[PDB]
Design an enzyme around this catalytic site. Structure first.
Site, PDB file in Angstrom:
ATOM      1  N   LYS A   1      47.172  38.169  32.127  1.00  0.00           N
ATOM      2  CA  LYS A   1      48.086  39.135  31.532  1.00  0.00           C
ATOM      3  C   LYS A   1      47.275  40.371  31.162  1.00  0.00           C
ATOM      4  O   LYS A   1      46.146  40.244  30.692  1.00  0.00           O
ATOM      5  CB  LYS A   1      48.749  38.556  30.265  1.00  0.00           C
ATOM      6  CG  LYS A   1      49.762  37.453  30.521  1.00  0.00           C
ATOM      7  CD  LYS A   1      50.204  36.786  29.227  1.00  0.00           C
TER       8      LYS A   1
ATOM      9  N   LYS B   1      42.665  42.865  29.384  1.00  0.00           N
ATOM     10  CA  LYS B   1      42.994  41.877  30.383  1.00  0.00           C
ATOM     11  C   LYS B   1      42.642  40.490  29.824  1.00  0.00           C
ATOM     12  O   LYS B   1      41.478  40.169  29.563  1.00  0.00           O
ATOM     13  CB  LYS B   1      42.291  42.176  31.720  1.00  0.00           C
ATOM     14  CG  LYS B   1      42.675  41.214  32.832  1.00  0.00           C
ATOM     15  CD  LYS B   1      41.866  41.489  34.044  1.00  0.00           C
ATOM     16  CE  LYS B   1      42.140  40.494  35.106  1.00  0.00           C
ATOM     17  NZ  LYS B   1      41.393  40.853  36.328  1.00  0.00           N
TER      18      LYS B   1
ATOM     19  N   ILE C   1      51.417  45.265  30.401  1.00  0.00           N
ATOM     20  CA  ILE C   1      51.321  46.066  31.624  1.00  0.00           C
ATOM     21  C   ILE C   1      51.552  45.133  32.834  1.00  0.00           C
ATOM     22  O   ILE C   1      52.638  45.137  33.415  1.00  0.00           O
ATOM     23  CB  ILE C   1      49.965  46.862  31.719  1.00  0.00           C
ATOM     24  CG1 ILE C   1      49.775  47.851  30.544  1.00  0.00           C
ATOM     25  CG2 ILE C   1      49.812  47.582  33.084  1.00  0.00           C
ATOM     26  CD1 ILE C   1      48.319  48.429  30.396  1.00  0.00           C
TER      27      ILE C   1
ATOM     28  N   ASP D   1      39.794  44.178  50.668  1.00  0.00           N
ATOM     29  CA  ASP D   1      41.230  44.139  50.447  1.00  0.00           C
ATOM     30  C   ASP D   1      41.731  45.384  49.709  1.00  0.00           C
ATOM     31  O   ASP D   1      42.493  45.285  48.747  1.00  0.00           O
ATOM     32  CB  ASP D   1      41.637  42.814  49.769  1.00  0.00           C
ATOM     33  CG  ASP D   1      43.136  42.598  49.590  1.00  0.00           C
ATOM     34  OD1 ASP D   1      43.900  42.855  50.554  1.00  0.00           O
ATOM     35  OD2 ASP D   1      43.549  42.230  48.470  1.00  0.00           O
TER      36      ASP D   1
ATOM     37  N   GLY E   1      49.424  34.342  37.473  1.00  0.00           N
ATOM     38  CA  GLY E   1      49.532  32.905  37.236  1.00  0.00           C
ATOM     39  C   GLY E   1      48.851  32.447  35.960  1.00  0.00           C
ATOM     40  O   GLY E   1      49.373  31.578  35.251  1.00  0.00           O
TER      41      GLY E   1
END
Ligand SMILES: COc1ccc(Nc2cc3[nH]c(-c4cn[nH]c4)cc3cn2)cc1OC
Length: 257
Positions: free
Chosen positions: A23, A38, A16, A132, A20
């Protein structure tokens, strides 16, 4: 391809996301159920970074119970070399969905707005200000928006870096009111098809516009007056003059009809 998380075996389907040192994979368990795993590489991670990851996982695990508008974390495996997080698989993130969809249904928008408020409200009730928020932070799971992260864990280079959802007070320098501005930007995008300062290409000129009170944000007339009021209330530059989440939850736009 295959992987193990806490004794349980998972078949990899497709990758998906990325990063850095991270994944995200779409997987299947032994019962042929779909999940997102994840994977996080901790080889080049310093102590500050590790505690940011540990803090975020702890808050994700704790807030599972408090709202279904927060992504499900089913299990995790954490060592000194890696983190594996077994999570809820989503259909698509809100940013990709918004970029793909030409028009947006007023009912669908109101529905998503409600979910965004419930998710953000929950984190605030535990002392968390995201700081954020962007549409990428939300996942569409069965026509229902879910918050995927809390803004605690250190971000990595792979929507990321954007200033289109940045409150004027973040540019000057954080209170829960900061998240209200960012949420207001997402709703403005879902209303007018662009963020309030999207037309300003130059980053410096853009940051100058967000903090400039003489720079009037245009709110074109629409059939939903309640919606236009929400936008005007969320996008008040002075945090003290800005509407709060408990106030937005009692607003006509979220409650009427
Ligand atoms: C449009 O591509 C997709 C985007 C998101 C998901 N679903 C998804 C994404 C996720 N990201 C994270 C994540 C949490 N923190 N950082 C990444 C968890 C998670 C769960 N499901 C599925 C997609 O289709 C293949």
């Amino acid at each position: 391809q295959s992987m193990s998380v806490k004794g349980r075996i998972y078949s990899i389907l497709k990758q998906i996301g990325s990063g850095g040192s991270s994944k995200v994979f779409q997987v299947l368990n032994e019962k042929k159920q779909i999940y997102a795993i994840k994977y996080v590489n901790l080889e080049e991670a310093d102590n500050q970074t590790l505690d940011s990851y540990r803090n975020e996982i702890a808050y994700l695990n704790k807030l599972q119970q408090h709202s279904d508008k927060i992504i499900r974390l089913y299990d995790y495996e954490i060592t000194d070399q890696y983190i594996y997080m077994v999570m809820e698989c989503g259909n698509i993130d809100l940013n990709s969905w918004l970029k793909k969809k030409k028009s947006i249904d007023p009912w669908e928008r109101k529905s998503y707005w409600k979910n965004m408020l419930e998710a953000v409200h929950t984190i605030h009730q535990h002392g968390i200000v995201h700081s954020d928020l962007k549409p990428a932070n939300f996942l569409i799971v069965d026509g229902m928006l879910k918050l995927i992260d809390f803004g605690i864990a250190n971000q990595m280079q792979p929507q990321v870096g954007t200033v289109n959802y940045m409150p004027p007070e973040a540019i000057k320098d954080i209170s829960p009111k900061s998240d209200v501005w960012s949420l207001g930007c997402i709703l403005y995008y879902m209303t007018y098809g662009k963020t309030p300062f999207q037309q300003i290409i130059n980053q410096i000129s853009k940051l100058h516009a967000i903090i400039d009170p003489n720079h009037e944000i245009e709110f074109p007339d629409i059939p939903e007056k309640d919606l236009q009021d929400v936008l005007k209330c969320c996008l008040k530059r002075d945090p003290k003059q800005r509407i709060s989440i408990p106030e937005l939850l009692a607003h006509p736009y979220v409650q009427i009809q």
